[PDB]
């Protein structure tokens, strides 16, 4: 079970949520009671996991938005981790970007931060 590659993160919350939504509804098609005497830990993690991602209103979140938001993000010069925070955190208001958002120091400018609110709202 050796892990060859420790990391490779671009899985935005929507991606993982979407995979889980297809998986949950697909596992039940073949849901088995033979494997109950064996394994059931998988069911619990997927089930509860869906809810936490669901907290973020990825309900109504779309696949195209990932590229659409990304196209705006590349201009801002924020790092890949920062953008994932920006999509996953989905800052509802300016204060989270204004204060909660990472790398606030220097790059804030009170210019693109205001523009980001228009982009994040989109």
């Amino acid at each position: 079970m050796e892990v060859k590659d420790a990391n490779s993160a671009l899985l935005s919350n929507y991606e993982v949520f979407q995979l889980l939504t297809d998986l949950k509804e697909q596992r039940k098609e073949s849901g088995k009671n033979k494997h109950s005497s064996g394994q059931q830990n998988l069911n619990t993690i997927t089930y509860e996991t869906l809810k936490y991602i669901s907290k973020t209103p990825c309900r109504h979140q779309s696949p195209e938005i990932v590229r659409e938001f990304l196209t705006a993000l590349k201009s801002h010069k924020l790092t890949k981790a920062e953008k994932l925070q920006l999509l996953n955190h989905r800052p509802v208001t300016a204060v989270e970007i204004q204060l909660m958002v990472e790398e606030s120091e220097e790059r804030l400018t009170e210019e693109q931060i205001e523009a980001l609110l228009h982009t994040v709202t989109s």
């Binding site: 079970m1 050796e2 892990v3 060859k4 590659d5 420790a6 990391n7 490779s8 993160a9 671009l10 899985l11 919350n13 993982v16 995979l19 889980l20 998986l23 073949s30 088995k32 494997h35 064996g38 394994q39 830990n41 998988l42 619990t44 993690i45 997927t46 089930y47 509860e48 996991t49 809810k51 936490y52 907290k55 973020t56 981790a81 920062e82 925070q85 996953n88 955190h89 208001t93 204060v95 989270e96 204060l99 909660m100 990472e102």
Partner: protein
């Protein structure tokens, strides 16, 4: 969340030879790597894809089929730069306990850094006043086997301001 490329030798018992391998390996690998934190890696969840499945041997003993499987699985591992949103499923006087919603109740924040009205005085007082946000700060996992927990976190709360709720 982060993808983790992993390699496992997955043994399909011979009464599953009707089903397709890439599905019937995936049913095994979910039973192998769910709700299990891998040391220095993170909390595995489920199977993303099987990126490369190589040829099904059958060994001189078992009669089963052992396919070495390259795959990618999504895991839970905060990147030391994430402002998460959880819920307080517990309050200890040394520090609060936050839990991500039905994810893992194993994130234990130490509390020393918020505004100078900080104590938990055993009557379940959250914070002496002026969903809950969290900053995951360090990676900390302890390998359990020792003789003949395990992803705990330390979680901060700086001067965010928290405009909506205090």
């Amino acid at each position: 969340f982060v993808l983790v490329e992993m390699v496992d030798t997955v043994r399909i018992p011979p009464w599953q030879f009707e089903r397709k391998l890439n599905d019937s390996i995936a049913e095994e690998l979910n039973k192998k790597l769910a709700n299990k934190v891998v040391y220095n890696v993170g909390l595995c969840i489920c199977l993303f894809d099987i990126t490369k499945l190589e040829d099904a041997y059958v060994f001189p003993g078992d009669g089963a089929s052992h396919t070495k499987v390259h795959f990618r699985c999504v895991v839970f591992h905060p990147f030391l730069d994430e402002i998460l949103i959880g819920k307080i499923k517990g309050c200890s006087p040394e520090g609060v306990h936050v839990s991500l919603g039905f994810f893992d109740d194993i994130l234990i924040p130490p509390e020393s850094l918020q505004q100078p009205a900080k104590f938990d005085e055993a009557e379940q007082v959250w914070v002496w006043e002026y969903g809950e946000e969290i900053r995951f700060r360090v990676v900390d996992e302890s390998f359990v086997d020792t003789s003949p927990y395990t992803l705990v976190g330390s979680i901060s709360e700086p001067g965010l301001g928290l405009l909506s709720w205090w």
